[PDB]
DNA sequence: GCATCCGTGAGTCGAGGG
DNA sequence: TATAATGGGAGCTGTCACGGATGC
RNA sequence: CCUCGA
């Protein structure tokens, strides 16, 4: 299907939670030794997605 | 056959004021306040100036440089605003069928108000060339028909006719009166001035207008 | 306006 | 760490997404591997594709490919060996797959 | 060759030391040569005396500081990317008021960067310059209120970041208001806090009609200073509890606290001179015996009332006057950042005095130097006035050091800079050059110190004048500020003098900048020289008086862009300043005393002086500068040569026998040439390359690091996977390219291997591996290669390793390797040339010699300039330079033609006649008469009125030669040019803008992280920006597909660009584009703003541009 | 422009001025849902008024409105255009509150989307044109002729 | 004599009468001969070419 | 200037329609290896190799020259799209 | 920012025809590099594409026949030249590229006015239109020789310059 | 109706230096 | 994990034209 | 940010 219009509207808390793949519960980015993302933090692959293709 | 004279007269280089500064006097100069110094530079660049004369001139030189510098920003900003108002304006159809038009006048009231005198040739050309007649015009035993794209010769003829008292204003189709939605039709726009022929439908005409107004912007003093 | 001034005032109430 | 917007991040390339050259190179590699696999029998080409894991993404054991074709693991290993051998012959002949080894 | 100088003006004083504005300023700030107890309260000494004593141990006081010797020399500092600095120690004593115990120690505060001999710095191995800043001087000013004519505003201005500006206005309701921190309040309140009474103010301010009545408010006089102080503290601090000690503290810090409020020393002087008062300190009031005592306010209000009423002797102020603008030099700016770092150190000192053991505290336990270190480090590394030094040529650095900027910390933010700041004020005369400024945005905001100008201890610029008493011109020269200069009548430097007496009954002079014709009886002073009006660069332009200023600007600026040439020459026409510039830029090496030269070498000169001592001067040879130009010195003396003090020993870069050599003297013809010099382009002869004119050495630096990783170490090695002996040929055993090798784009400078990571072999890789039976190696080739368009000969290699003596690197890096690559640059097509008169252009054609216009004796011209560049540019100085250059070409001599006092037309004509004799009588004796072509050209010239009819061919050729013109033959036809052509020697330079550095192209390359659009810049192999306006161009043409291509397939449509590259390498047409990735970025960033952005179709049903990958 | 010797055709200025006059202000709503003082486009109010006149209802009383070039550009229907111009915050909040649909009529919107612009070779007037040789044309004509 | 205005009118008239292909050929020809003749023309600039009139 | 550009502009009501015609025709020629050209062997645009005159590889030069002959037909809704595609694939296979 | 683009100093190109510009060899190689790879495959210069790219990788590996291949690649094609600032639509124009030795773009004398270009150090950017549609647009609508009159006034825009005027006048 | 404080804009493309 | 400890601290400001709320 | 170029 071809794009014709572009609409912009306020987002309801339910809509926002529907976008979300997980809640970010910790202000953690990555681990100081492993340099891998921390659980429930801002870079967690559990929410946002895998860092490597299909792994 | 003097080099300066030749370059100036041909148009290859130079204008009278520059040649004057090279040969005659350099002239009056402005103080930093914009006020003019009472005594001018009497020297030419041929003769060379005094350090005081050179200094007196540096004021205006610098003010002009600063004027150019602060100007280009305002010109560019203006251009962007003009682009943003006009960008959707495109030649969308061949004719909107409007019966409305504007009447370009060929005479302007004198500042004395002593009469109504003729407009300058270039001004009439800039208001008439390439336009489309919205009404029949019969002048000097010539019929210029409704729907005619005015050639430069048609314009010169209309000027001649005005000089003979036959016509004081020309009815013409114009984007002011076009009824095309989201843009303009072919007849109300007239020539694609780059090709001296009627405009192709699809011409991005508002962008062209914005660029045409904005490009000389840094020349305006 | 300034949040620490506001908090210091609220604290100066008790 | 330091701020990307110091901008300072506009000098930072993306090592992750494959470049257009890399994408085209893997494309021509897959196309040329299929060109070369077509010169084998469909069973030996299929044995190689299963053993390399191309068909379903992972590499099967010899017993899985052998039970897939209904044959002994020694037999499927011998089919893989002769398929690899014919591939080595064709490649030494036409020299087509050499450049892709870096 | 003999040098003839023109001009009748005898200049009383030489130019001052040109870098003195830097060197003396910094020496004054540091006082490192002064025994501590003799130091003045200026400089970093002032910063110490401001910070200390620190109170509430109970007390920490400062005795003295000292600067040690630098840990490393300047060369080594450039090598190892260090800062050239000295350790700073300060003696502090801790005193407990109760215990009486006194513990004193010398604490180490870190290092302070040292200025080099030439007034520059070395910060992290890079030479930098601290640019002086111009700003409004502190003081008390009175301006016309722009809203209300007849009303005026009084403004009290301290030093930047030394307290707020204060305004005094007379309100339309009649009450006099004070504004501070954008808070208007009645001045009478503060007057009451100062301890004034209605009687005192009524007798002081009563004489002014109806004005003092607006100052009378009875509710203010009905309260003692205490209650009025609390009232003002409430008016200035809403919400803060009005406790008496808190109000005293705030108001004291606002006005009376010298540790917070500071007029300049110049601020105090100007306040005193304006208001007719005397200041004890530098604050507006004092705290004396528990009460506030007034210094500034009442005199200011008196002056304001008097200016409003119109009483005589009271005038408004011109804030652009150079008596009300002052210069902050390097010493002052550095001292300011020193003061800030010290303030932080003291805050930490008090924070430590409250914590910790109260019994056991040393100076060392109390003081953490780190914040002071940080302040110095930031001032020198990241301040706006701390600039990467321009050392393209020695004049570049000297000009950089004499710059004046109006931007910077506390400086005018741009777009707040109107016409007034950028104007040249009449008071610029003799202080700030009126021509040398940048064109474009920075015009008027960056300027240059005039050649004779000086910055005094108060920071005002002073210029020298000669005392004139009773028509007699003394040799006493007085340096005046603009304020002082406005008192006198100053005659022009060219006023005719017989001996020391004025010889003209009418004398041109200045009175407050106004030109006036005046009798010798009226002359109070006289200019020292025309040179004193212009910068150092403008003073290098011969015949400046014949060049319009807008192009003199360009010639001035472009001299700093000139590249040092291997065969560089001084100009055949000079201004006389050419040697002082070499001397003061420390380019060339000179003799320290009389002596005899012992040894002379490419590397070293050994000299024996009159003392018998043997001094050895090593020569800097093929060194790289900030801009990549070769800096080196060549010996100009010979073994056994007798030398006196100040005689030339070695020539620096762009120096010929101690003269400034920014370019080459070339033989020029001014004529069109087949459109190849259309619109300022230039035509040159291949003969210039054959003899190595306009050839320069350029050195580039390349750097690579081997670091520890979490996947294993990087290493510099010769063992690199999948590379033949062809690739590793010029690499030595350790893997670094060998000295002397020629390196081309793609060649390896330093081999390096890195362990592979995240390695999942794709099934194609596994199958190909099995087919070719080769194990994938652990590491991969990360070597440093020559970037496209670069290369040359390797001339140096530096290698630093971890675990090696003197070597410690940033954490994790094992080693650093730096390769230096020199190249010899011949002139080529696209390189920029220019002259001193603003004539600039790019070489567009290089003709073989036989196509060059040539003189009848067979000599071909070097370059062909188009005459159409001259008329509208109005820079005729280049024409006079050309005529005198012709004369000097045939006489074999050079000239010195000082600006505004130099070679005039008649003397140039005399020289041209002398030259004509050499150019022609030689031929007439050699057995040749006039030529047929010369006769035809003479006929044409007769029709032009260029020669008189009836004279002989030789007489007419001489008439033409005296006009500078000569007969010239087209080398292609051998037929003469129908006219006689202007031909002569011109001084021309190759500017730093060479097409080699600028030519760049890209098919595909690195893309940005977030936007997935190409990177920018030649070094990143970047793409060109197709901005909004290029888009407008394409839209106007109606080229929808060209534009969509620009927006998708060529930038950030990932699938599109990959598919396009594959299509083109397959010989297929390009696929239709798809959504650009940065639009998806926009959508996701709007979602982050809690806004839902929906792409819809015509049935208003959503469309997924993320292809389901973002939906659950 | 004449005083600086710049020759410039009136119609460019006329186009810009026509955009300056794009809007009107309501003096009386008539039978419409509009409010007194509500600003809108002359085209839209003429459409509403011809709908109400063909319906027999009362037309909207309206007055012409001159606004300068910045204000006219910020008042355009397309929110992508307006937000990319300037006042991004104001434009985006009002567009989001009103739930505005951008129909992608102009050039800026489609540039932002990477779509093919509605001008030149991208004009609906010319972009569906087809090219065929007489060989293929007659070979298709026969296939239409047998059915 | 041929100068800026007359050459401009020439180009315009040629556009109107002969089309842009021929006008482009014309422009190239004008370019070639203009450059050729300006080379040999004798045009130059010496200081004596800036002629102070005695009337000054 | 492109040869015969004035006649090409004469052929259409809008110059952009000329551009669309030419580009679609160039795509046809590239897709079918020029086997569908309306150009006689002598009207074939040529390019000067080092060996000698070879065919012009530029499909747009071609398409313009074809357009100048009159042998091409342009317009809106002359045939369904997939029908033109399949008939060209039939007469000229890829 | 955009791929298949470059920039260099401009130099006057008097010998050029109005529809032409001088393009440096190395600029052209990098700009057309995929087409060059394809053509090098079409001839004996490389067995495949990857070998040809590795062949162009180093400057001493580049041989003569690849330049002739580049000539066969650019035949009939145009590039866009652009000068900043782009004040009106003629700040971008289309030209047939003529391969030149050297590193400077060669610009035609009659278009400088439209670009506000001269040769005191100006630089221009080059862009390669990729598709058949891009090249049709560029060769028809944006070609220099097709845009001779000002879209603003209607007067000739590409017209005799001072140097040209000077000879004709003389 | 008319002063006043707040917010938002003020040319492009390069290059380098960081 | 226990002596008692109780409201911060940085603060240079040389533009201008627009809509819009805020006040007199 | 700065400086520089157009
Ligand atoms: Mg230029
Ligand atoms: Zn219409």
D10 within some domain: no
Q: Report how far apart, in Å, the C-alpha atoms of E570 and of each of E655, E658, E895 are.
A: 7, 9, 11
Q: In E1008-1054, which ranges are E strands?
A: none
User: CA E285, CA E279: separation in Å to the nearest integer?
Assistant: 9
Resolution for this PDB entry, in angstroms: 2.8
> Which residues on chain I are in Cβ contact (under 8 Å) with H59?
132
Nearest residue by alpha-carbon distance to C1' of K19 = F71
Q: Say how far apart CA E135 and CA E156 lie, in whole Å.
A: 15
For residue I44 the two structure tokens come to: 């004996």
In a domain, D4, yes or no: no
**DSSP bridge partners of E634:** E651
Helix axes B16-23, B3-10, angle to 10 degrees: 170
Between the alpha carbon of residue E632 and those of residues E12, E348, F52, F139, the distances in Å are 35, 48, 89, 81
Contacts 24+ apart (CB under 8 A), E212-220: E212/E305, E213/E174, E214/E170, E214/E171, E214/E173, E214/E174, E214/E175, E214/E176, E215/E175, E215/E176, E215/E187, E215/E188, E215/E191, E215/E301, E216/E188, E217/E175, E217/E186, E217/E188, E220/E186, E220/E188, E220/E189, E220/E191, E220/E192
Check whether the bond before F118 is cis (ω within 30° of 0).
no
Chain L: bases < 7 Å from a protein Cβ: 1-6
3-class DSSP state of E326: strand
In E588-598, which positions are buried (b, 16+ CB within 10 angstroms) versus exposed (e)? bbbbeeebebe
Cβ of E1041 and F122 within 8 Å? yes
What are the tokens at F57?
A: 């209802």
Taking Cα atoms as reference points, which of E397, E698, E423, E371 lies closest to residue E565?
A: E698
- For E547-558, the DSSP string reads B-HHHHHHHHHH
- DSSP state, B36? B
- E511, containing H or E segment: strand E507-511
How many of the other CB atoms lie within 10 Å of CB of I60? 10
Nearest nt to the E246 alpha carbon by C1' = K7
Contact between F127 and F121 under an 8 Å Cβ cutoff? The reply is: yes
Give the phi and the psi of residue F61 in degrees, each rounded to 5: -75, 125
Q: Which residues of A touch F103 (CB under 8 A)?
A: 4-5
- Chain E residue with CA closest to H32: the answer is E1068
Q: Residue E126 CB closer than 7 angstroms to strand J? A: yes
Instruction: Specify the number of domains making up chain H.
Output: 1
User: How far apart are the C-alpha atoms of C5 and F83, rounded to whole Å?
Assistant: 37
Does residue E927 contact residue E37 with C-beta atoms inside 8 Å? no
What sign has the CA pseudo-torsion B205, B207, B210, B212? negative
Distances E458 to E260, E268, E323, E328, I6 between C-alpha atoms, Å: 20, 10, 11, 9, 53
Q: Is the CB of C1 under 7 A from strand K?
A: no
Nearest by CB to I2, from E830, E843, E1026: name it.
E1026
Look up the CATH number of the domain holding residue E779. Answer: 2.40.50.150
Residue F136 makes CB contacts below 8 A (sequence gap 6+) with H36, H84, H87, H88, H91
In degrees rounded to 5, what are phi and psi of residue B51?
Answer: -60, -35
Q: How far apart are CA E398 and CA E119, in angstroms?
A: 9
User: Residues of H with CB below 8 A from B195's CB?
Assistant: 9, 15
Residue B185 labeled ligand binder? yes
Q: Name which of E1030, E1080, E1035, E1086 is nearest F88 in CA terms.
A: E1086
Residue D44 lies in a domain: yes
What is the distance between the alpha carbons of residues I6 and E1000, in angstroms, rounded to a whole number?
Answer: 5
Q: What are phi and psi of F72, to 5 degrees?
A: -65, -40
C-alpha span between I94 and E1039 (Å, rounded): 12
Spell out the residues 6+ positions from residue E1097 whose beta carbon is closer than 8 angstroms to its own: A1, A2, A3, A4, A5, E1103
Interface of I with G (CB under 8 A): 14, 17-19, 109-110, 145-146, 148-149, 155-156, 158-160, 163-170
- Among E879, E882, E888, E951, which residue's Cα sits nearest to residue E918? E888
Please tell me which residue lies nearest to nucleotide J9, judged from CA to C1'.
F86
Using the structure block, give the residue that is written with the tokens 């009659």. I110
Ligand nearest to the CA of B199: 2
Tell how far the Cα of B174 is from the centroid of ligand 2, in angstroms: 7
Going by the DSSP 8-state scheme, the letter that residue E252 receives in this structure is I
Residue D33 in any domain: the answer is yes
CB contact under 8 A, F129 and H88: no
The answer to whether E730 touches E718, Cβ cutoff 8 Å, is no
Residue with the two structure tokens 């950042």 = E337
Query: To the nearest whole angstrom, how far is the Cα of A3 from the nearest Cα of chain F?
Result: 9
Chain G touched by H10 (CB under 8 Å): no
Q: How many CB pairs under 8 A join D and E?
A: 81
Reading the block at residue E228, the tokens are 């009025």
Tell me how far apart the alpha carbons of residues E312 and B88 are, in angstroms, rounded to a whole number.
65
F73, B85 contact by CB (below 8 A): yes
Q: State the DSSP H helix or E strand holding residue G23, giving kind and residue range, or none if neither.
A: helix G4-40
Q: Which residues contact E75 (CB under 8 A, 6 or more apart)?
A: none
Considering only the beta carbons, identify the residue of I76, I77, I137 that sits closest to H19.
Answer: I137
Where b means 16+ CB within 10 Å and e means fewer, E498-522 reads eeeebeeeebbbbeebebeebebeb
Q: E424-427 long-range contacts, Cβ below 8 Å, gap at least 24?
A: E424/B32, E424/B58, E424/B59, E424/B62, E425/B32, E425/E318, E425/E320, E425/E321, E425/E322, E426/B31, E426/B32, E426/E512, E426/E513, E427/E321, E427/E322, E427/E323, E427/E482, E427/E485, E427/E513
> SS3 sequence, E573-628?
EECCCHHHHHHHCCCCEECCCCEEEEEECCCEEEEEECCCCEEEEECCCCEECCCC
CA–CA separation, E587 and E809 (whole Å): 34
Local structure of residue G42 (DSSP, 8 states): -
CA/C1' separation D98–K8 (Å): 72
Question: In the complex, which nucleotide's C1' lies nearest to the CA atom of residue I9?
Answer: L6
CA-to-CA distance for D72 and D52, rounded, in angstroms? 19
Strands E152-157 and E166-170: antiparallel
Domain with H73, as residue range(s), is 1-94
Cβ E439 to strand L below 7 Å: yes
Question: Around E822, how many Cα atoms within 13 Å sit in the side-chain half-sphere?
Answer: 19
| Token pair recorded at residue E796 | 């140096």
Question: Residue I85: is the preceding peptide bond cis (ω within 30°)?
Answer: yes
**E63 neighbors E93 (Cβ within 8 angstroms):** yes
Residue E655, phi then psi, degrees to nearest 5: -140, 130
B1, B31, B204: residue with CB nearest E1038: B204
Helices D42-51, D20-37: axis angle to 10 degrees equals 140
Q: Which residues of B fall within a CB distance of 8 Å from I152? A: 193, 208, 211-212, 215
CA distance I68 to chain H (A): 8
Ligand nearest to the CA of I107: 1
For ligand 1, the distance from its centroid to the CA atom of residue I116, given in whole angstroms, is 8
Nearest to E212 by CA among E305, E294, E150: E305
Residue E734: domain span: 696-825
Give CA–CA dist E209/E1068, Å, rounded.
Answer: 93
Cβ contact E418 with chain J strand, < 7 A = no
Taking the C-alpha atoms of residue E185 and residue E177, their distance in angstroms, rounded to an integer, is 6
Taking residue E529's Cβ as centre, other Cβ atoms within 10 Å add up to 24
Does nucleic acid strand J have an atom less than 7 angstroms from the CB of E1065?
Answer: no
Q: How many domains does chain D have?
A: 1
Q: How far apart are CA E783 and CA E794, in angstroms?
A: 16
Q: How far apart are CA E331 and CA E133, in angstroms?
A: 11
Q: Is E403 helix (H, G, I), strand (E, B) or coil?
A: strand
CA of C14 to C1' of K7 (A): 11
DSSP E44-109: HHHHHHHHPPEE---EEEEEEEEE---SS-HHHHHHTT---EEEEEEEEEEE-TTT--EEEEEEEE
Q: What is the CATH number of the domain that holds E305?
A: 3.90.1110.10
Residue D2 lies in a domain: no
Which approach determined this entry?
A: X-ray
Phi and psi at E1109, nearest 5°, equal -70, -10
Q: Where are the extended beta strands (E) located within I113-170?
A: 123-127
CA nearest to B136, candidates B147, B146, B128, B127: B146
The pairing of strands E461-469 and E604-609 is unpaired
Residues of each annotated binding site of I for Mg(2+) = 118, 120, 122
Backbone angles phi, psi at E598, to 5 degrees: -80, -60
CB crowding E135-163: b at 16 or more within 10 Å, else e: bbbbbbbbeeeeeeeebbbbbbbbbbebb
Tokens describing residue E25: 């300023």
Burial call E390-429: b when 16+ CB within 10 Å, e when fewer: bbbbbbbbbbbbbbbbbbbeebbeeeebeeebbbbbbbbb
Q: What is the CATH number of the domain that holds H72?
A: 3.90.940.10
Interatomic CA distance for residues F145 and E114, integer angstroms = 96
Contact, E384 CB vs strand L, < 7 Å: yes
Counting ligands in written order, the one closest to the CA of E681 is 1
Largest Cα span, chain D:
65
Strand J at less than 7 A from CB of F123:
no
Is B122 at the interface with chain F, CB within 8 A? yes
Chain H closest-CA separation from residue F117 CA (Å): 13
Distance CA E97, CA E101 (A): 8
Q: How far apart are CA E1004 and CA E1061, in angstroms?
A: 9
């Amino acid at each position: 299907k071809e794009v014709r219009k572009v609409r912009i509207a306020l987002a309801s808390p339910e809509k926002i939670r529907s976008w979300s793949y997980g809640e970010v519960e910790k202000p953690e980015t990555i681990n100081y030794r492993t340099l891998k993302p921390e659980r429930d933090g801002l870079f967690d692959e559990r929410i946002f997605g895998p860092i490597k293709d299909y792994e | 056959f003097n080099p300066l004279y030749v370059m100036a007269q041909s148009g290859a280089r130079g204008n009278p004021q520059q040649i004057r500064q090279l040969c005659g006097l350099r002239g009056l100069m402005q103080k930093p306040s914009g006020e003019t110094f009472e005594v001018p530079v009497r020297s030419s660049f041929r003769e060379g100036l005094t350090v005081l004369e050179y200094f007196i001139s540096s004021h205006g030189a610098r003010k002009g440089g600063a004027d150019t510098a602060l100007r280009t920003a305002d010109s560019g900003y203006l251009t962007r605003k003009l682009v943003d108002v006009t960008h959707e304006i495109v030649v969308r159809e061949a004719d909107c069928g409007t019966t409305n038009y504007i009447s370009v006048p060929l005479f302007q009231p004198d500042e004395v108000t002593r009469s109504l005198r003729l407009r300058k040739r270039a001004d009439i050309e800039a208001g008439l060339y390439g336009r489309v007649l919205a009404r029949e015009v019969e002048v000097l035993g010539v019929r210029l028909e409704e729907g005619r794209y005015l050639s430069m010769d048609d314009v010169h003829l209309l000027i001649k006719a005005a000089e003979a008292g036959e016509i004081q204003e020309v009815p013409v189709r114009s984007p002011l009166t076009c009824q095309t939605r989201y843009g303009v039709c072919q007849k109300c726009y007239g020539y694609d001035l780059s090709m001296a022929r009627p405009v192709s439908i699809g011409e991005a005409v508002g962008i062209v207008a914005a660029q045409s107004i904005g490009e000389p912007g840094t020349q305006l003093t | 306006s300034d949040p620490v001034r506001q908090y210091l005032h609220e604290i100066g109430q008790v | 760490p330091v701020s990307l917007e110091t901008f300072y991040g506009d000098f930072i390339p993306d090592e992750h997404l494959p470049s257009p050259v890399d994408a085209a190179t893997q494309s021509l590699l897959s196309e040329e591997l299929e060109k070369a696999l077509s010169k084998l029998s469909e069973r030996e080409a299929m044995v190689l594709k299963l053993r390399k894991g191309l068909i379903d993404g992972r590499e099967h054991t010899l017993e899985e490919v052998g039970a897939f074709f209904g044959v002994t693991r020694e037999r499927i290993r011998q089919i893989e060996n002769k398929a690899l051998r014919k591939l080595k012959y064709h490649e030494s002949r036409t020299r087509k797959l050499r450049d892709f080894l870096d | 060759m003999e040098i003839k100088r023109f001009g009748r003006i005898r200049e009383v004083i030489p130019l001052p030391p040109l870098t003195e504005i830097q060197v003396e300023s910094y020496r004054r700030a540091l006082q490192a040569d002064v025994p501590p107890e003799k130091r003045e309260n200026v400089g970093i000494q002032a910063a110490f005396r401001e910070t200390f004593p620190i109170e509430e141990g109970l007390v920490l006081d400062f005795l003295e500081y000292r600067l040690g010797e630098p840990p490393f020399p300047q060369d080594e500092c450039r090598e190892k990317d260090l800062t050239y600095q000295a350790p700073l120690y300060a003696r502090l004593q801790l005193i407990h008021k109760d215990t009486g115990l006194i513990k004193e120690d010398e604490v180490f505060l870190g290092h302070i960067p040292l200025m080099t001999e030439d007034g520059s710095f070395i910060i992290n191995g890079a030479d930098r310059v601290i640019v002086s800043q111009i700003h409004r001087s502190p003081g008390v000013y009175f301006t016309p209120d722009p809203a209300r004519p007849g009303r005026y505003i009084a403004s009290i201005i301290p030093l930047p970041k030394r307290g707020p500006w204060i305004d005094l206005e007379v309100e339309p309701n009649g009450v006099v208001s004070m504004k501070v921190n954008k808070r208007k309040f009645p001045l009478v309140l503060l007057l009451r806090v100062l301890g004034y009474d209605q009687e005192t103010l009524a007798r002081e301010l009563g004489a002014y009609g109806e004005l003092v009545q607006g100052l009378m408010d009875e509710s203010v006089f009905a309260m003692r200073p205490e209650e009025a102080l609390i009232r003002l503290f409430t008016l200035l601090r809403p919400g803060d509890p009005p406790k008496r000690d808190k109000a005293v503290a705030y108001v004291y810090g606002l006005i009376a606290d010298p540790r917070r409020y500071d007029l300049g020393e110049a601020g105090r002087y100007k306040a005193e001179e304006k208001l007719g008062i005397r200041l004890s300190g530098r604050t507006l009031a004092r705290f004396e015996d528990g009460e506030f005592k007034d210094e500034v306010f009442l005199p200011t209000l008196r002056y304001l009332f008097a200016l409003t009423a119109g009483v005589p002797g009271h005038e408004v102020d011109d804030i652009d006057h150079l008596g009300n603008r002052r210069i902050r030099t390097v010493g002052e700016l550095m001292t300011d950042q020193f003061r800030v770092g010290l303030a932080r150190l003291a805050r930490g000192v008090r924070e430590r005095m409250l914590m910790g053991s109260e019994d056991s505290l040393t100076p060392a336990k109390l003081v953490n130097s780190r914040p002071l270190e940080a302040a110095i480090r930031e001032f020198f590394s990241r301040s706006q006035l701390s600039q990467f030094k321009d050392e393209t040529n020695p004049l570049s650095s000297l000009r950089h050091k004499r710059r004046i900027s109006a931007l910077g910390p506390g400086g005018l933010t741009r777009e707040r800079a109107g016409f007034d700041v950028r104007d040249v004020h009449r008071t610029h005369y003799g202080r700030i050059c009126p021509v040398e400024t940048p064109e474009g945005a920075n015009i008027g905001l960056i300027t240059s110190l005039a050649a004779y100008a000086r910055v005094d201890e108060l920071g005002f610029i002073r210029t020298p004048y000669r005392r004139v008493v009773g028509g007699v011109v003394t040799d006493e020269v007085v340096y005046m500020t603009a304020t002082e200069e406005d008192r006198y009548t100053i005659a022009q430097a060219n006023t005719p003098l017989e001996g020391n007496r004025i010889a003209a009954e009418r004398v041109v002079a200045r009175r407050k900048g106004e030109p006036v014709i005046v009798s010798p009886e009226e002359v109070e002073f006289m200019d020292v020289s025309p040179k004193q009006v212009f910068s150092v660069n403008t003073n290098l332009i011969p015949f400046l008086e014949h060049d319009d200023a807008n192009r003199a600007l360009m010639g001035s600026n472009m001299q700093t862009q000139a590249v040092p040439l291997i065969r560089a020459q001084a100009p055949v026409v000079m201004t006389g300043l050419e040697e002082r510039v070499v001397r003061d830029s420390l380019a060339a090496l000179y003799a320290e005393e009389d002596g005899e030269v012992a040894k002379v070498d490419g590397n070293r000169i050994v000299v024996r002086y009159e003392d018998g001592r043997l001094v050895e001067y090593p020569l800097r040879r093929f060194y790289r500068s900030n801009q990549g130009t070769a800096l080196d010195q060549r010996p100009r003396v010979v073994v056994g040569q007798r030398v006196r003090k100040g005689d030339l020993l070695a020539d620096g870069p762009a120096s010929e026998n101690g003269f400034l050599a920014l370019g080459q003297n070339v033989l020029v013809a001014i004529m069109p040439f087949d459109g190849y010099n259309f619109e300022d382009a230039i035509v040159i002869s291949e003969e210039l390359l054959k003899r190595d004119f306009y050839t320069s050495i350029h050195i580039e630096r390349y750097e690579i690091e081997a670091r520890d990783t979490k996947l294993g170490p990087e290493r510099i090695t010769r063992d690199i996977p999948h590379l033949s002996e062809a690739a590793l040929r010029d690499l030595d055993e350790e893997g670094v390219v060998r000295i002397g090798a020629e390196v081309k784009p793609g060649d390896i400078l330093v081999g390096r291997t890195s362990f592979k990571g995240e390695s999942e072999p794709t099934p194609e890789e596994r199958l190909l591996r099995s087919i070719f039976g080769e194990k994938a190696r652990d590491v991969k080739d990360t070597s440093l290669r020559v970037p496209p368009g670069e290369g040359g000969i390797v001339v140096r290699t530096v290698r630093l390793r971890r675990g090696d003596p003197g070597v410690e690197l940033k954490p994790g890096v094992r080693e650093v390797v730096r390769v230096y690559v020199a190249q010899k640059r011949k002139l080529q097509v696209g390189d920029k040339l220019a002259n001193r008169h603003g004539n600039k252009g790019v070489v567009a054609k290089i003709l073989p010699v036989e196509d060059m216009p040539h003189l009848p004796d067979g000599t071909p011209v070097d370059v062909i300039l188009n005459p159409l560049g001259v008329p509208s540019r109005m820079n005729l100085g280049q024409i006079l330079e050309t005529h005198l250059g012709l004369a000097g070409y045939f006489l074999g001599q050079r000239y010195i033609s000082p600006i505004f006092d130099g070679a005039k037309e008649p003397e140039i004509k005399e020289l041209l006649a002398q030259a004509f004799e050499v150019y022609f009588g030689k031929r007439k004796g050699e057995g040749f008469g006039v030529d047929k072509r010369e006769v035809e050209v003479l006929r044409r010239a007769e029709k032009l009125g260029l020669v008189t009819p009836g004279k002989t061919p030789e007489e007419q050729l001489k008439e033409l030669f005296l006009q500078g013109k000569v007969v010239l033959y087209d080398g292609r036809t051998g037929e003469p040019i129908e006219g006689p052509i202007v031909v002569g020697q011109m001084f021309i330079m190759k500017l730093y803008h060479m097409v080699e550095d600028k030519m760049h192209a890209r098919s595909t390359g690195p893309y940005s992280l977030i936007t997935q659009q190409p990177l920018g810049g030649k070094a990143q192999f970047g793409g060109q920006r197709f901005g909004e306006m290029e888009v407008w161009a394409l839209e106007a043409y109606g080229a929808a597909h060209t534009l969509q291509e620009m927006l998708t397939l060529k930038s950030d449509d990932i699938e599109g660009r990959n598919a396009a590259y594959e299509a083109i390498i397959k010989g297929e047409d390009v696929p239709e584009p798809s959504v650009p990735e940065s639009f998806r970025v926009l959508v996701k960033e709007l979602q982050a703003l809690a806004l839902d952005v929906q792409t819809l179709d015509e049935k208003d049903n959503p469309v997924d541009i993320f292809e389901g990958l973002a939906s659950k | 422009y004449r005083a600086q010797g710049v020759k410039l055709h009136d119609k460019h200025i006329e186009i810009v001025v026509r955009q300056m006059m794009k809007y009107v202000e309501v003096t009386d709503p008539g039978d419409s849902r509009l409010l007194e003082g509500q600003v809108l486009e002359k085209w839209d109010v003429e459409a509403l008024n011809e709908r109400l006149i063909a319906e027999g209802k009362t037309p909207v009383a309206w007055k012409p409105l001159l606004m300068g070039v910045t204000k006219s550009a910020l008042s355009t229907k397309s929110w992508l255009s307006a937000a990319s111009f300037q006042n991004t915050t104001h434009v985006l909040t009002e567009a989001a509150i009103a739930g505005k649909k951008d129909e992608l009529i102009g050039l800026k919107e489609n540039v932002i989307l990477g779509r093919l612009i509605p001008a030149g070779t991208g004009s609906d007037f010319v972009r569906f044109t087809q090219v065929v040789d007489q060989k293929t044309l007659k070979a298709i004509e026969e296939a239409r002729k047998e059915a | 004599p041929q100068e800026k205005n007359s050459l401009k009118d020439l180009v315009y008239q040629a556009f109107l009468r002969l089309g842009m292909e021929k006008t482009a050929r014309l422009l190239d020809a004008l370019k070639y001969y203009g450059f050729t003749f300006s080379t040999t023309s004798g045009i130059t600039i010496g200081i004596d070419d800036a002629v102070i009139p005695e009337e000054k | 200037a492109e040869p015969g550009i004035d006649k090409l502009f004469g052929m259409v009501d809008s110059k952009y329609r000329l551009t669309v015609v030419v580009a679609k025709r160039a795509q046809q020629l590239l897709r079918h290896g020029f086997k569908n050209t309306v150009l006689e062997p002598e009207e074939r645009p040529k390019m000067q190799t080092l060996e000698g005159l070879f065919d012009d590889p530029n499909a747009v030069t071609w398409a313009m020259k074809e357009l100048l002959t009159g042998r091409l037909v342009f317009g809106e809704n002359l045939v369904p799209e997939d029908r033109l595609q399949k008939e060209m694939e039939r007469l000229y296979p890829v | 920012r955009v791929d298949y683009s470059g920039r260099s100093v401009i130099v006057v190109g008097p010998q050029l025809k109005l529809h032409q510009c001088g393009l440096p060899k190395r600029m052209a190689l990098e700009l057309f590099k995929p087409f060059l790879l394809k053509k090098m495959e079409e001839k004996g210069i490389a067995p495949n594409v990857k070998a040809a790219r590795r062949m162009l990788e180093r400057q001493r590996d580049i041989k003569d026949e690849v330049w002739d291949a580049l000539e066969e690649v650019i035949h009939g094609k145009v590039v866009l030249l652009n000068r900043a600032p782009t004040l009106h639509r003629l700040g971008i124009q289309a030209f047939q590229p003529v391969l030149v030795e050297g590193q400077s773009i060669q610009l035609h004398p009659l278009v400088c006015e439209a670009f506000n270009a001269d040769f005191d150090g100006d630089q221009m950017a080059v862009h390669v239109p990729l598709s058949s549609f891009a090249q049709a647009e560029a060769r028809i609508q944006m070609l220099s020789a097709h845009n001779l009159l000002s879209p603003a006034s209607g007067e000739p825009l590409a017209k005799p310059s001072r140097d040209i005027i000077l000879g004709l006048y003389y």
